[PDB]
Write an enzyme that holds these catalytic residues in place. Structure first.
Site, mmCIF file in Angstrom:
data_model
loop_
_atom_site.group_PDB
_atom_site.id
_atom_site.type_symbol
_atom_site.label_atom_id
_atom_site.label_comp_id
_atom_site.label_asym_id
_atom_site.label_seq_id
_atom_site.Cartn_x
_atom_site.Cartn_y
_atom_site.Cartn_z
ATOM 1 N N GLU A 47 51.084 36.006 42.001
ATOM 2 C CA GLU A 47 50.278 35.940 40.792
ATOM 3 C C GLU A 47 51.095 35.770 39.515
ATOM 4 O O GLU A 47 52.011 36.551 39.265
ATOM 5 C CB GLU A 47 49.411 37.196 40.618
ATOM 6 N N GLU A 88 37.526 38.782 39.230
ATOM 7 C CA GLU A 88 38.155 40.082 39.119
ATOM 8 C C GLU A 88 37.735 40.706 37.805
ATOM 9 O O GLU A 88 38.549 40.989 36.934
ATOM 10 C CB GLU A 88 39.675 39.893 39.143
HETATM 11 MN MN LIG Z 1 44.380 38.728 39.022
#
Ligand SMILES: [Mn+2]
Ligand SMILES: [Mn+2]
Ligand SMILES: [Mn+2]
Ligand SMILES: [Mn+2]
Lengths: 288, 289, 289, 288
Positions: free
Chosen positions: A150, A244
């Site tokens: 990420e 998210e």
């Molecule tokens: Mn994330």
């Protein structure tokens, strides 16, 4: 493409009864439930098998997100820590294989949250992490899992802050199951261009997380969703998109995500369900 | 509108020869130079006078930014710290009076950077802060200084993250010279709407900091500049606009602003000067009605 | 490296003017290019053609040409006498451009403008005839060192080519050297799903670009996504020029042809028009890179 | 907020069996069906009552859109045309009362489409139009109808091209049932600011037409939808929102709306239904 949502949108701790959420998201219409890796290691082999059964029965695919602890830091200059970290990922990855999960994402090249108080040696952490990741990548490839890195904003990590840095790291790792993972919240802060960052990630883009600038569910904020959809089309993206959102104060989640005001505007579980469903319809419509 | 730039765009520490910067920005066309408060408590009277005369002679107005230390935290639960904090601000505001500076801004209701490791008590800190700020505001008023509270993103503070919270805090303080300060970088993260946040600040907006989403000079990034100008016109904004670009790694500045890659793309000083001047032209053209 | 220009009609209400006057004005404001209307050029003696060229050269200005063909110059016409007149007209015009040293002409050159929309439309037929006719004229353009740029227009002004994808399809079918697609932000703003996408679609075929806000004001304070445009030009590696074509005044043939029914300039005198054009020029150089 | 769609999205002429569209639209979930006024003068009172009953039985509200002919031009310098025009709207408004329609919109102060070759006397037409609209408005009030004046782009009309001009005109008419009507397609061309144009219309805004920049259904284009929802909330808009997408070539509609390429990309009726439905979910989510 397949759409999912992180279970943590409804919870204030980094674990929960995941079967409860698999059923919930299947009813709301999601393809994917993303779960935190944290509690997994503590699962008996039987628990792993039923969770996997719950997911199959509800037609839900499971993805995993993980915030490594300081002792699971693949970039550490401490060989005992890199040693523990590799052991940790090796076990976790075999569990994911038995769980039938094919994707794990997060700051897997470092740790999260991090202590920004310590001294920072970016060059050395980078070199070690590349080596360490390459090694864990053999195990990930053996377990049929994409190891997704990420790209994060500067306040949460200092190693990889832009899609370009993400691509450079993964190219250096030079291994089959290592991918770049972009997140609209992080891109919103660091990128000169959102569509440009996605085009830069191109074929290395293995997963995408979504959320508004301040982490509300997708749709009514300022993220350039149409531009994102066009960029995914340009790179022929065929991975999944997991939202998210984090809109509640309290617990370790509220503290780690730094939600210091009630962004949910007092929504109850039913209200949160309805907004995620509306964001889902919105995402399938605009992003595809 | 008056336009300025923070000297830190060219430096890696929270202090520098500000006279050098007054001369540079005057030539580039700026109206204002923002400087860091950090070294001012150590200036002798003649150094203050010389800085003030330099600014006046170059037609430059000085504004001040400050990141308070933990020892200067007006919201501290520790009474000794609040006492030291007020004494610190009192001395600083008097120096600002001697300098002919009429605006100070930053996380003045708290401190920065914050050790996020400690337990957070938002309610108590908020209540203590309002009281501490009310009395420091009185000193500021007597010194002819607007005391501007910056709204910051969640990673840098937990007390005030949106324009609405800043309005809430400033209305509670209820002192005419205490104002809300918005910053495009911070709004970009927390706000549902940019023009909306500005209209919400309204008559309470006392100062505006600008920068692209990743803190480059204004213009070629994703900040909605035209929308900002329209909103400033909607609220009749009378104040000034100071860009705070940060594009270089290194030093305390680099570490506190968390620049972990060379965002300037190898720019030398002359290249930095030219980009700032183009950003200035851009800001005057786009932000004003 | 990129060259910027402006259409002289920004200051005039008719399709012709003392272009020498505009070459000097525009050189003083800082532009690289002056775009002029083709209309008067056939009436020019050999001498006036040579002195307009000497003026441009003496002022360091490059001239580009825009043309709205008349119905009798319509290369797409089903009437063979019109196609013949059209080809003769363009052959004469192109040789004159070769003498004036201009290397680019653009407009609805595959059709005519303005067009009478009351007639029944035969898009397919006009399309085929036009491709054949343009391919022919292209041979003269190539011989004259001229890029024949086909402007993509909105649906209210033409029916043959309304998107960048249609322009590329037409140009690839013509399949000849000096025929290019020409995009215009005002036109793209109406018809395109994506501005950056339209530019990336045009790609190597983009031979010229016109700019203006959604309602034709000078670039900068409107809603056109300028940063996205600059990013797309860099993505394709654009090597052409960018000419703004603002129209903000009512009156005359320009006023009715461009349909300006309100004083968009808000009372601007010539000096104010110059200043706004210069500010848009600085904006364009900065943002479009 | 109530949401509708113009029946013409599925038809190529300015008429159709509206009962078929009332049923379709109710099934897709809309609250409103907008219909063209032109075939209404050819309806018997029996046809009017049955259209009204069909609308009522399906829980659909009806709004009307009209493009006046040159003979119905309330701005005409020819006193006879003005007289005929007033007679035409009086009859029409009475029919709408009978139909239980409370809103009519379009270039009602002029005519559409316009013959642009004619000499233009804007000042003259404007004054005549203000005088004529004021009279018709007394009938509109009597009939319980809001006479909504559409602000159009310059290629379609020369009298009113921006919300400010719309507001100027309605203020000068100074009569109860006259409102400004904005349209995202038209605003996209003429306005300096979209939210700004909505805030300018403010209390005079009586109706809103939606569509992408190139008239596709709302959602995947460049219109700034969130900004529009923000501005509608700022002015406390209590009206309805009707999408007017046009994605098909052919017929009088194709010709008048100038659809010269297949914007629908081969869509069949079911595909058109599907897209309208997704644009409806999007509009309710993003604009409220
Ligand atoms: Mn994330
Ligand atoms: Mn700031
Ligand atoms: Mn043009
Ligand atoms: Mn409309």
């Amino acid at each position: 493409m397949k759409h999912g949502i992180y279970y943590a949108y409804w919870e204030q701790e980094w674990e929960a009864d995941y079967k409860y959420y698999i059923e919930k998201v299947a009813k709301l219409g999601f393809d994917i439930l993303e779960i935190a890796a944290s509690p997994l290691p503590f699962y008996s082999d039987i628990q792993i098998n039923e969770l996997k059964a719950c997911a199959h029965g509800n037609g839900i695919t499971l993805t995993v997100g993980h915030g490594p602890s300081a002792e699971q830091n693949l970039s550490s200059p401490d060989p005992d820590i890199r040693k523990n970290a590799k052991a940790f990922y090796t076990d976790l990855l075999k569990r994911l294989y038995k769980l039938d999960v094919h994707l794990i994402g997060g700051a897997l090249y470092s740790y999260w949250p991090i202590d920004y108080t310590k001294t920072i040696d970016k060059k050395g952490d980078w070199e070690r992490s590349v080596e360490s990741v390459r090694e864990v990548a053999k195990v990930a490839e053996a377990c049929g899992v994409d190891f997704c890195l990420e790209v994060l904003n500067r306040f949460e990590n200092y190693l990889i802050n832009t899609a370009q840095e993400g691509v450079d790291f993964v190219k250096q790792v030079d291994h089959n199951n290592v991918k770049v993972m972009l997140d609209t919240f992080h891109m919103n802060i660091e990128e000169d261009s959102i569509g440009g960052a996605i085009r830069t990630a191109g074929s290395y883009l293995g997963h995408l997380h979504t959320g508004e600038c301040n982490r509300k569910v997708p749709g009514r904020g300022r993220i350039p969703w149409v531009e994102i959809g066009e960029a995914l089309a340009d790179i022929g993206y065929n991975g999944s998109v997991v939202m998210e959102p984090f809109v509640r104060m309290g617990g370790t989640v509220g503290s780690n995500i730094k939600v210091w005001r009630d962004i949910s505007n007092g929504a109850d579980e039913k209200m949160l369900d309805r907004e995620a469903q509306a964001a889902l319809d919105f995402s399938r419509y605009v992003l595809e």
